[PDB]
Amino acid sequence: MIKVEIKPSQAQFTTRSGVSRQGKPYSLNEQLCYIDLGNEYPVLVKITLDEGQPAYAPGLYTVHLSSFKVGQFGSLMIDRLRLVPA
Template identity: 35%
Template sequence: MIVIEVEDKPVTEKPWQRDGRSGISRSQTAYAATYDTETGKLKRYPVETRIRLGQDQAPYAPGVYILSPTSIYVGEFDALAVSPKLIGFDDFMTMVAPVIQQQKKAG
């Protein structure tokens, strides 16, 4: 479970061009609570990151979110990929509760 906090910051919009196509990339600053790979412990301070927003997606309201399980998918070359989507803790627990219950029964 990755915890991400969004502060009251504006959406950043940057134009892009590639292969004859163009558009606007939208993102919002957030802070991710990450783990130190050497110690295996939660880092003392969150790391600033950017969460991409869809073209018509409303910005996330200030608050604490969880990285949604729907953020992780199998992409190119059958490798895991991440496209961050944020959800509240209660929504996260609703999504993972069936898996947790199944594991309790099996264990």
């Protein structure tokens, strides 16, 4: 299991916006977190949230299976990091 932490300072998201190739508006909400990748300290990672989802509250989390998909070359890829409480 991957250990993800949302620190007290990371409790908010920011929003970027724009227009798709054929005219549709979009909005993307982004939040930061720390992930332990086995180095001396956890590293900073950007998360893009799914539509209609609030920012994750401070605390410890792990990664949900729905984060992964098989890519166009047949290998596993991350789609979006989706988190669940630890």
